[PDB]
Design a protein around this ligand. Structure first.
Ligand SMILES: O=c1[nH]cnc2c(CN3C[C@H](O)[C@H](O)[C@H]3CO)c[nH]c12
Ligand SMILES: O=c1[nH]cnc2c(CN3C[C@H](O)[C@H](O)[C@H]3CO)c[nH]c12
Ligand SMILES: [Ca+2]
Ligand SMILES: [Ca+2]
Ligand SMILES: [Mg+2]
Ligand SMILES: [Mg+2]
Lengths: 326, 326
């Protein structure tokens, strides 16, 4: 197995990503997680991370790992309605089984001490083998580590597998002030994304909307978790997906996708997608396309490996199988 | 046990109300249900009703009953975001267990043939013993039965226990062209509500916001369903409540309440609340208070028994216990 740190922001797919990483122990050793106050309220995202970890630890092969709240602050905050989802999950019966929340209350004090950005730096820098960072929220934490530690940090990163951006397709940030070309994780903190995408000697894999658009969360697939209710993880994953199957009803053709789950699936098994090198820059200016990830023809600019044409069925099967881990 | 029909509109508390009624076999014989296209999309609300019924049939010997979709149409439709919740529920693992879905698929076509309004009229009029109607959506269906059948229908109603209105407290319908004095179930179809509240020889119990304000859905209580994951009904009820606990974060002091559940609890046990007779009229004209339930001074105006001083703790315990039936 390879060392992985999950750098997430506590939406539903972030937690599915966590389940994927934590359940595939032969491929992934999940050595830590951090939660950013972006697409969640960080207190809730933190507690849900702990509750999921404890559920899994108490029912399967999963060493406990440190969980930190990131100090990162928004440039452009997420909509409040989207940030609420970790609050809902914090209250879900599946995440509040007595033995699991007992464990979480016992191990919480240690985890409360951490600051997520420093934790990310430490886990990466202090690991014997290189660490893969699975980034499923904004890029603020990776940028903070690059800024503070430079090559001392980046040399220890195997690769950074990032959910974010939109290269050859429209974005998903649709605000009166925006032109729709930006994707939300980048838009939340464009300057940090720019630092990450421009960093030489950091290997980056990018799951932009170009690839994640192929995995909308659809009812028939979600209902398959109902076939697996003997498994706690299937109740968990299926519940989280069931909470997003209406989004396409609200936003025609623009619902919820397994964005972060596909990203984590690639960390588990790179057969999830082939990747193409693209030099990626980020618009940081307060223009309508703030946060857009754009190709740059700048000489000697670092490459980012953009996922294309993912193996959607392989991914969907991986998740259904992984959710039978307990 | 007394005969009860549930006339609901497919939001989360509607389904908690259904569970409360159905699980209390000693007190309630649930002989039918109908779903209205009000605070849900009726196809989803219909399917969730069927899926809950089938779960309960297969796990606690609950007799099957007819389920109809009402043809009622909105005067003032609900916000689309609120109507989505039955979509989410339709996809929940707990409601998609194969044995239960197989049963629902087998029997759903027979239920699809009913007109919901006619089903309400027929179940009431054809019953050997009188029927209590628990109305947790708008009053359109009871009004239709009154308009079509008059005393032939109302004489067969034991009582109508209604979630709706706001008598001595503010409402919950807030837009620049309303004054916030109306409650949503009434506002959805004011004229139907007027027909029901003004109908002589119909016993009405009214759970207005005056009483339901005592039962906000809050995280600590909701998390107690986590103590009960050995019970399918607690996974179900707790999941539905967990989907509500953020609403107060979105609307300060104006979150989600156990509106319909408290109403159904009264059907199970009238000790849930005292009632006081009030003559209730409904504003139907295009006024800022369209949909408001007001005291009327009209001579000989029919009385409605408005719930007061509900036993909130008794209710909370009743629901936690009922959710342990299976
Ligand atoms: O509809 C939405 N509901 C919640 N969050 C979002 C995001 C942001 N996040 C969600 C995923 O966690 C992913 O990391 C990123 C996609 O832009 C984009 N649209 C929605
Ligand atoms: O915040 C809300 N989310 C969903 N629905 C509503 C209603 C309408 N319904 C909800 C209950 O089913 C109840 O019957 C009625 C209360 O006005 C009022 N506020 C909200
Ligand atoms: Ca995310
Ligand atoms: Ca209702
Ligand atoms: Mg165990
Ligand atoms: Mg007024």
């Amino acid at each position: 197995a390879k060392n992985v740190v999950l750098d997430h922001d506590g939406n539903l797919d972030d937690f599915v990503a966590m389940v994927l990483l934590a359940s595939n122990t032969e491929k992934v050793r999940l050595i830590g997680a951090l939660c950013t106050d972006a697409d969640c309220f960080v207190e809730n995202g933190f507690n849900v991370t702990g509750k999921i970890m404890c559920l899994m630890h108490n029912n399967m092969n999963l060493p406990l790992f440190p969980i930190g709240k990131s100090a990162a602050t928004a440039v452009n905050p997420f909509p409040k309605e989207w940030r609420c989802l970790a609050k809902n999950m914090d209250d879900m019966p599946i995440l509040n089984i007595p033995e699991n929340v007992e464990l979480w209350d016992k191990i919480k004090a240690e985890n409360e001490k951490y600051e997520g950005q420093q934790l990310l730096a430490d886990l990466v820098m202090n690991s014997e083998e290189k660490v893969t960072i699975c980034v499923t929220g904004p890029l603020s934490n990776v940028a903070w580590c690059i800024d503070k530690y430079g090559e001392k940090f980046t040399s220890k990163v195997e690769e950074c597998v990032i959910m974010g951006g939109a290269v050859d397709v429209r974005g998903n940030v649709f605000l009166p002030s925006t032109d729709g070309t930006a994707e939300w994780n980048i838009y939340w903190d464009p300057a940090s994304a720019k630092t990450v995408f421009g960093c030489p000697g950091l290997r980056r894999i990018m799951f932009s909307l170009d690839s994640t658009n192929t995995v909308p969360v659809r009812s028939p697939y979600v209902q398959r978790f109902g076939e697996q209710t003997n498994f706690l993880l299937s109740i968990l994953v299926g519940t989280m997906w069931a909470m997003c199957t209406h989004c396409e009803l609200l936003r025609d053709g623009d619902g919820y996708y397994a964005w972060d789950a596909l990203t984590a699936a690639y960390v588990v098994d790179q057969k999830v997608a082939n990747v193409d090198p693209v030099p990626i820059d980020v618009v940081v200016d307060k223009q309508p396309n703030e946060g857009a990830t754009v190709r740059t023809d700048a000489e000697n600019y670092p490459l980012t490996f953009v996922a294309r044409n993912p193996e959607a069925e392989f991914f969907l099967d991986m998740l259904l199988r992984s959710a039978r881990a307990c």
